[PDB]
Design a protein around this ligand. Structure first.
Ligand SMILES: Cc1cc2nc3c(=O)[nH]c(=O)nc-3n(C[C@H](O)[C@H](O)[C@H](O)COP(=O)(O)O)c2cc1C
Ligand SMILES: Cc1cc2nc3c(=O)[nH]c(=O)nc-3n(C[C@H](O)[C@H](O)[C@H](O)COP(=O)(O)O)c2cc1C
Lengths: 134, 134
């Protein structure tokens, strides 16, 4: 009587300020099958551009970031993980992405999907460094 | 095809508190809260459901943002305000609150999505850094 319906679930995901994505594993890729508006705003990429691609384009030229090894191992072991990564928007600007990945098993196909949540921590990091200097 | 199970998992994974409230008269009472909201406020889902979120203001009221929230809600505008809020144990924190009115043709009920996050540290840093800058 008083409880939410499924359209409300979509509304909560749409209202989120952090990016929220769903990806599915294929071989060495985990390809984006859903992104919310905040992900497009945060990354500068449109939904049409980046769907069915692995999120690693957000690392740009940066690789062998330690968090990436931790993510790969957590993915292999079926465990959730959280890493702060250097990421880059479509225009090339850098941001610090606090990224969480949660595997969830879909009852429909009994397939494991991966929920990402991207939070821009750049301002908090830079301000922490500035105050450390001060 | 993102089903309701996956949408729910996306809400459950959110770092930020996420709630749904429905308006009855001058109350908007909580009909859903996620785990991040419970951890942020220290209240369990069973304690706070079907109550207006204003209990989080505690002894405080007449904060300027509250007046802005009221006007924005009456006008159906989304809004964002940083409010002083209080946990179950009484501890104070700065809550960046984003309220989004839900537009739905399906049911007559008017709903609001709240998104809450603890900005206390960023506020502390901002004031300290501004003072030291002088
Ligand atoms: C659901 C999901 C979301 C992801 N989001 C990001 C992201 O926003 N930024 C990023 O740098 N990596 C993200 N990744 C990690 C990469 O997609 C990839 O798994 C990681 O770089 C390790 O794979 P690789 O060594 O083959 O590049 C995400 C991974 C998953 C599964
Ligand atoms: C969906 C939603 C979530 C809200 N969350 C909070 C909150 O977390 N903390 C808070 O102090 N007020 C929150 N509010 C605002 C109060 O519920 C209330 O609308 C505000 O105090 C102004 O109403 P009032 O002047 O009648 O007290 C929320 C409102 C809505 C609609």
């Amino acid at each position: 009587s008083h409880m939410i319906n499924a359209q409300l679930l979509q509304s909560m995901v749409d209202a989120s300020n952090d990016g929220i994505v769903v990806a599915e594993k294929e071989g060495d890729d985990t390809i984006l099958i859903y992104v919310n508006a905040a992900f497009e705003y945060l990354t500068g990429y449109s939904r049409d551009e980046i769907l069915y691609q692995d999120c690693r384009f957000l690392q740009g030229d940066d690789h062998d970031q330690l968090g990436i090894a931790r993510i790969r191992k957590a993915m292999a072991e079926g465990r959730p993980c959280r890493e702060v990564l250097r990421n880059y928007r479509k225009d090339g600007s850098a941001f610090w992405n606090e990224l969480s990945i949660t595997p969830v098993k879909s009852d429909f196909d009994q397939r494991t999907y991966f929920i990402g949540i991207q939070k821009d921590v750049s301002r908090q990091v830079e301000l922490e460094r500035e105050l450390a200097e001060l």
